[PDB]
């Protein structure tokens, strides 16, 4: 049977979300691409470049108008008439708007597309702006994190394909399945938090016993994601497990909430 058309575009970004996707352990990204979806446009992976890539973009969005899912990584800059991010000689925002117009739904991968991420941190030189402030007439599913967890990305994809519907979302557009609870409410170091057992300086005796990272700046108490449950990279670790507090990377504005090493 034909597979669902997917167009994946890239604004201002670091490409971490694309890298995260290809880390998926189950299903393998290979199997997602070969068997689950039709990944019809993606600047990182596609053979065609230049005019041949432009032809792909135009053919797909025309032939599959109203039927494709638009995945977006990164964001549009409003500064310099949009020419902080140029595609085919024109502002990226024009590509975003054209792609969004024909989409049935939009997945905003990562904190860049969802909220702004690093380029939007003070003083936001380029006036980088999240997708949902530009596209206001399409469903947008926010999948935040810098990047989101690989197997969260693939689980969201499989859910949508298997169940033929968008995931249910919270009031900010995040899938409830993975973003309904805080890091701190599923953190394996919570016993230490509750007992007042804290790392006070790096590599102290507390750190060598896996005590809580709150006093080292962990932002788990205010961050919604699946890192403490699903974990990263085939479940091998997550930030806190390897000794660093959560930075807050799934939350809007996390770069500008003070130092990562200042409490709460």
């Amino acid at each position: 049977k034909p597979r669902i058309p997917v167009v994946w575009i890239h604004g201002l970004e670091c490409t971490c979300c694309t890298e995260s996707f290809i880390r998926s352990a189950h299903p393998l990204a290979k199997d997602v691409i070969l068997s689950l979806i039709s990944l019809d446009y993606d600047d990182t992976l596609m053979a065609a470049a230049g005019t041949q890539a432009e032809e792909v973009f135009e053919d797909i969005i025309t032939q599959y108008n109203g039927k494709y899912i638009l995945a977006v990584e990164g964001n549009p800059p409003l500064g310099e008439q949009g020419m902080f991010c140029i595609s085919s000689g024109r502002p990226f925002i024009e590509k975003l708007k054209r792609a969004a117009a024909g989409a049935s739904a939009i997945i905003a991968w990562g904190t860049c597309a969802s909220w702004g991420c690093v380029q939007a941190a003070r003083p936001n030189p380029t006036q980088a702006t999240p997708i949902d402030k530009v596209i206001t007439d399409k469903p947008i599913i926010k999948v935040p994190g810098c990047p989101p967890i690989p197997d969260v990305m693939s689980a969201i994809i499989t859910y949508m394909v298997t169940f033929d519907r968008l995931p249910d979302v919270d009031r900010m557009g995040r899938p409830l399945m993975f973003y309904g609870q805080r890091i701190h409410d599923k953190c394996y170091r919570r016993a230490h938090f509750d007992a007042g057992e804290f790392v006070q300086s790096w590599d102290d005796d507390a750190a060598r016993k896996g005590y809580c990272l709150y006093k080292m700046g962990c932002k788990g108490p205010t961050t919604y994601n699946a890192c403490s449950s699903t974990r990263w990279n085939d479940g091998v670790s997550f930030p806190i497990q390897s000794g660093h507090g959560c930075l807050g990377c799934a939350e809007n504005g996390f770069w500008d909430r003070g130092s990562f090493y200042s409490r709460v």
Partner: protein, 581 residues
Amino acid sequence: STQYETQGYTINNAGRRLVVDPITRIEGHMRCEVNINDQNVITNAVSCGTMFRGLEIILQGRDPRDAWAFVERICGVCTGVHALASVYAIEDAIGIKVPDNANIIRNIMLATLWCHDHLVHFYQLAGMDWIDVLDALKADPRKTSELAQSLSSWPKSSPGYFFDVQNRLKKFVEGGQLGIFRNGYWGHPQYKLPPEANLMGFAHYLEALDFQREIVKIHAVFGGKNPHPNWIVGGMPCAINIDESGAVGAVNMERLNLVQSIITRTADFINNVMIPDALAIGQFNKPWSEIGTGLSDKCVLSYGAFPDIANDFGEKSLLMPGGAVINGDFNNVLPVDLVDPQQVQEFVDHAWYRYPNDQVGRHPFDGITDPWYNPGDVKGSDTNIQQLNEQERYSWIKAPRWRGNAMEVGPLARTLIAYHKGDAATVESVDRMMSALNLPLSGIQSTLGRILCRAHEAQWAAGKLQYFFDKLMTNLKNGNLATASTEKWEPATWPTECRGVGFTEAPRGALGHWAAIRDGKIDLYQCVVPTTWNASPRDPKGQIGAYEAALMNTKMAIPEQPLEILRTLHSFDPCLACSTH
């Protein structure tokens, strides 16, 4: 039109203009334009970075301890390398010395990223320039097996496997949804592999796509996650506990066992899949040992990397050598000093930035990032560019030079530096590779050579992973567990005003971060990244950078189909988010 001479090239923008925008199978956003004469030969090449974010501006006023986390987000492809350069820079400024285990773990992080990044580049980014995927459908599975078995001991080579891979591909394209293969360059005359080699390569593309996910489990153990692992100023946050209560909360023997298992698997994949495939590309594409030389026979640069003596960034410590060659004189490998204002400078006369005097270069401690989108007299308009004006400002990438010279950086550059400094392992590897190809040493200075060197370096880094792991275990056996130095963690311990340089060799080449701290805050933070060097625009002398030089004089079979341009550009592994930051 105009014509001028530089670096042995005749730069001539008469004649037909070709544009490639977007460049795909890179990281980030690039535009390339060329002019080509009646003979279908490139006589002008223009490299344009089409994105900018402004990390150097965003970093001002931040706490130096946080800087690594911001600058890691320069790029998710060479993830970790900017964090490493950052902690190095801040430690250099403040005067922090990390414990040996932290240094060894950092070296493991960097070697793990070399293995991962080089593998994925070979297959997912560059591979389809060399492998005709649709031609794999014409292969005989038995002959594919025989070919693979002739080249490698790798187990996965049965006729039935190759049939199964071929049938998956056949099914994939049966409904007319070609996906990433749609509207490719398949059947172009420059595709020279026989069908069996295409099928072998395509099978390996899929095996690499699967396997690469495993490599980065090393980053997950020591750094929490990949992409974008965590680090600290003063060492690493992954405290170690092998034999005490609470080892379940730390890097313990089970975590180290996981790391060792990944190292073994990674070496085996690189040595038995990637290496033989690189050599096979060489065997079938020998003419590409003479195409794309660019600056690689002229000017090459390495800062060096992998300090084996903790906190010692000198020549006796760095396992990957540093040095510069200019004027084609490989008999004179010159030392690099990242503080010397006469060495590394960046120009902006052809870039979208303001300087007080755009006819001079600025060392990064004097660097300025004041964005100015001013494309001038383009064909088209400022929001609808048909042709950049390379006589004016044409890129978001600054133009770095070394003592005023335009340099190539990256795997080929490093290989040449190490070879000509007499590094025994490099000399042996290069000599064996070029002997296997029946090609002269000069054949490495080419587009093909960039690919061969990248594969060499994946093998080199996989071997170094084991070396570093064993050093870590030796320390642990001796009761040396420390992973962080915290005596200068608090801002009140820092100098009121200080500056430092952090440098390394990222997968794509020489990386430096230059930081000035004043009153507890970042006062200046300037980055010069490998793709900044390679994708550089011109300078006040009109000197061209590595990409523009490597494209010069290239023959195109079919002007409308940029395969030869893509081959050469992709051979540098362009990272445009890195280049612009």
